Design a protein around this ligand. Structure first.
Ligand code: NAG
Lengths: 49, 49
């Protein structure tokens, strides 16, 4: 859904149509997200500081 | 003939608690319309036009 804002999500209504379905049948209790960082010429290129 | 090499492939099928993922081919009869017929579209055995 396109929007032009930084915070305080709008009060508009938008349903979520279904997506692909996974027939797995496993256990689940925890999750974590993945992020991407950049290594330009400004940073020395080491993942320490 | 008995000393000639032979290729042997063994198929094994097992059942677990997971939903079935391997299924055989199905058949499909021709579609007749505007008549009092019986149909079964995977969720109900409905009779009608
Ligand atoms: C995971 O699933 C199995 C069978 O589906 C069940 O026996 C087990 O208790 C589940 N574990 C948790 C933590 O829910």
């Amino acid at each position: 859904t396109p929007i032009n804002l930084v915070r305080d999500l709008p009060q508009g209504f938008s349903a979520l149509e279904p997506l692909v379905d996974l027939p797995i049948g496993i256990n689940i209790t925890r999750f974590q997200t993945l992020l991407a960082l950049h290594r330009s010429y400004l940073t020395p290129g080491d993942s320490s500081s | 003939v008995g000393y000639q090499p032979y290729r042997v492939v063994v198929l094994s099928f097992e059942l677990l608690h997971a939903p079935a993922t391997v299924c055989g081919p199905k058949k499909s009869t021709n579609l007749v319309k505007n008549k009092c017929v019986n149909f079964n579209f995977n969720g109900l055995t409905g009779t009608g036009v």
